[PDB]
Amino acid sequence: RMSLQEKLLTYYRNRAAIPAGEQARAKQAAVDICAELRSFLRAKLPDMPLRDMYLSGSLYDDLQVVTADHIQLIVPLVLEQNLWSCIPGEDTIMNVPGFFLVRRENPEYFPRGSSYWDRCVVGGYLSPKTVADTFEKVVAGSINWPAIGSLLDYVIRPAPPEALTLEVQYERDKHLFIDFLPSVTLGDTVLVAKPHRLAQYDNLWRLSLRPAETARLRALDQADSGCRSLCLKILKAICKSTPALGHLTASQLTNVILHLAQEEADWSPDMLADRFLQALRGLISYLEAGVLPSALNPKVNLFAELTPEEIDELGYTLYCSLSEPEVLLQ
Numbered sequence: 001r002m003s004l005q006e007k008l009l010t011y012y013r014n015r016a017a018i019p020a021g022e023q024a025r026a027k028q029a030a031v032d033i034c035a036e037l038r039s040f041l042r043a044k045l046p047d048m049p050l051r052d053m054y055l056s057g058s059l060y061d062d063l064q065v066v067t068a069d070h071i072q073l074i075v076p077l078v079l080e081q082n083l084w085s086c087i088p089g090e091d092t093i094m095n096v097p098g099f100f101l102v103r104r105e106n107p108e109y110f111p112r113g114s115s116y117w118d119r120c121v122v123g124g125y126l127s128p129k130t131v132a133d134t135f136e137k138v139v140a141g142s143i144n145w146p147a148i149g150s151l152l153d154y155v156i157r158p159a160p161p162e163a164l165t166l167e168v169q170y171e172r173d174k175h176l177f178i179d180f181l182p183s184v185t186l187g188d189t190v191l192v193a194k195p196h197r198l199a200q201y202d203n204l205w206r207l208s209l210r211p212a213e214t215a216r217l218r219a220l221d222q223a224d225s226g227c228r229s230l231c232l233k234i235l236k237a238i239c240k241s242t243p244a245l246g247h248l249t250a251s252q253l254t255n256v257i258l259h260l261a262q263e264e265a266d267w268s269p270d271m272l273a274d275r276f277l278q279a280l281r282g283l284i285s286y287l288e289a290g291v292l293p294s295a296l297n298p299k300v301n302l303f304a305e306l307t308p309e310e311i312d313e314l315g316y317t318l319y320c321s322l323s324e325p326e327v328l329l330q
């Protein structure tokens with residue numbers, strides 16, 4: 001019957017690709033809200049050290065698949081270089097690459113109170129969990145979602161504690177989940193408060209990898225009009241659509257693609273099938289090895305948050321799907 005090429009482009013257009021209308025409006029609803037928060041921050045909280053919150057995520061750069069239902073709103077903290085320093089996780093006793101301790105420097109000389117964020121310090125370290133709670137409470141305590149919603153003809157209601165998430169119904173039957181992501185930038189190190197999976201690492205900030213990864217990907221496709229992004233979206237759609245693959249993330253799949261791009265120059269449209277197969281094969285062998293290095297930061301293993309058992313099950317699921325092509329593609 002059909003070639004894999006056709007099946008994939010077909011799968012992409014009927015499953016991976018968000019319908020044209022829905023993505024514009026979802027994205028626009030997010031844009032509309034982000035702006036209204038810009039003015040709220042000027043008026044209500046000129047005291048809290050922040051910069052303007054801005055959108056980020058797959059929906060914002062057209063990498064979101066199946067449904068336009070989520071996006072991040074970054075909350076950039078202001079931290080003074082003099083007062084704070086970030087510590088690579090591999091240099092901590094935790095020994096976890098891709099994560100940082102954010103340390104409060106010399107309290108004898110910089111007493112508590114020198115930074116607003118000193119209230120979020122636990123044992124000399126800026127706690128990511130506590131920053132989230134404080135922000136959530138300081139926002140919850142000054143914000144008027146019913147009014148912002150009325151102003152934009154959206155209904156906006158926070159969610160149950162996931163208190164850092166907003167549910168935006170922007171049409172009768174459409175909604176969008178915006179979650180707030182507190183971020184810190186020290187030097188050229190960008191960190192986000194997206195907690196490590198295990199509880200014992202909850203004092204660590206996460207190295208933000210998404211911007212460089214997606215910029216890299218976009219630059220490569222731009223250069224040669226390649227299908228790197230198209231292949232990623234298909235994979236994302238499969239993992240999202242297949243429960244057994246729920247542990248796979250956009251970040252891992254993107255790096256699978258980027259590693260492959262180091263070794264395949266030809267990403268013309270007709271090579272899509274071949275690259276997709278290579279990517280599947282790559283992912284499987286990364287899983288077997290128990291290690292998927294970040295293309296942009298080799299020291300970081302993007303499977304390090306997964307247990308060996310989960311890695312093993314992911315590997316098995318994928319092998320099995322090789323002989324169930326029609327379950328993999330819907």
Ligand SMILES: Nc1nc2c(ncn2[C@@H]2O[C@H](COP(=O)(O)OP(=O)(O)O)[C@@H](O)[C@H]2O)c(=O)[nH]1
Nearest residue numbers: 056057058064065072192194208209210211250
């Ligand atoms: N926007 C953003 N999300 C990040 C970052 N680091 C980790 N994440 C997480 O990774 C996910 C973002 O996924 P995304 O790239 O948008 O692809 P998708 O959610 O699978 O469509 C969310 O769960 C984020 O919390 C980051 O630096 N920026």
